[PDB]
Structures are given as C-alpha cells and as structure tokens.
Amino acid sequence: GKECDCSSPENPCCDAATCKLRPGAQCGEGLCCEQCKFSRAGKICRIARGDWNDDRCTGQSADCPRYH
C-alpha cells in the first residue's frame, strides 16, 4: 500500500522512515491543514466553478480532492 502522509521528506509533520505523521499533528501537508493540524471541517478545500459540491475540507482531511 502507501502511507506517505506527506510528500516532502523534510517536513516536520510527517516522517521519512515511515512516510507518515511523525508528531501528534493531524496532517503532513494539504490545503486545509494548519501547521501540523487538521483545518476545521465545513472549510473550503477548493472552489468548483459551476454547479456541484465544493471540496468542503473534512474534519479529518488536510489536502483537497477534486470533483470538477
């Protein structure tokens, strides 16, 4: 599988030995993740352009997906 919580091998929020959150933070990298923390759900992890469901950052998500 793949547990690379982050993509940077120098990030303090993740770990290179296991490519995953090293500290007790809540994320290694994303658009809705404070310095080692999960933003608050109901947040905007992106901005669609016409009609659909925005990428409301979840209370357990740090990056942002994409529907359109």
From Swiss-Prot:
Disulfide bonds join C4-C19, C6-C14, C13-C36, C27-C33, C32-C57, C45-C64. Residues 1-68 form the Disintegrin domain. It comes from the Eukaryota. Transmembrane segments: none annotated. A motif (Cell attachment site) lies at residues 49-51. Inhibits platelet aggregation induced by ADP, thrombin, platelet-activating factor and collagen. Acts by inhibiting fibrinogen interaction with platelet receptors alpha-IIb/beta-3 (ITGA2B/ITGB3). This is Disintegrin rhodostomin. It comes from Calloselasma rhodostoma (Malayan pit viper).
